[model samples]
Target: FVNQHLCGSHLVEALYLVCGERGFFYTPKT
Candidate 1:
């Protein structure tokens, strides 16, 4: 995702990671 920056015509960005433990990976992930 990105948002316009006021400093310039820059598009600040963001990163996300879906890291979680797999209680029962075969059944579900969180």
Candidate 2:
């Protein structure tokens, strides 16, 4: 539920990280 609790971007970034990416792909730009 934490995934849904957080923003979609947050979840996507975590997924990207899990896939072993740079984790920046799903992260929102500052």
Candidate 3:
């Protein structure tokens, strides 16, 4: 799953599922 940013209820849910409980904290961007 890909998105520019996470917002609102549905987006939040999607992000949560994709990112899991740790969330985006572990993602390293170039």
Candidate 4:
């Protein structure tokens, strides 16, 4: 999203839904 922190479970779900099929990688920033 914005390089912000995300919840573990939520992050997984979001990643799977958005990146799983689309081949996207999300980078988190502190």
Span of ten consecutive residues with least summed lDDT in model 4:
1-10
Task: In candidate 1, list every pair of residues with a backbone clash.
Answer: none
Give per-residue CA lDDT, model 2, range 1-30, as digits (tens).
Answer: 344455766777567657773544554667
Task: Tell me, by lDDT, which candidate is best.
Answer: 4
TM-score of each: 0.12, 0.38, 0.44, 0.39
Give the range where candidate 2 is weakest over 10 consecutive residues by summed lDDT: 20-29
Error of 3 at 21 (Å): 3.2
Q: Put down candidate 3 lDDT per residue, 1-30, tens digits, no spaces.
A: 344665556566676877796775433347
In model 2, state the lDDT of residue 6.
54
What is model 2's C-alpha RMSD?
5.3
Q: Lowest lDDT 10-mer window, candidate 1? A: 8-17
Better of 3 and 4 by TM-score: 3
Q: Which pairs in model 4 have colliding backbones? A: none
What TM-score would candidate 2 get against the native?
A: 0.38
Predictions in order: lDDT: 0.26, 0.60, 0.61, 0.72
Q: In model 3, where is the ten-residue run with the lowest total lDDT?
A: 21-30
TM-score of 3: 0.44
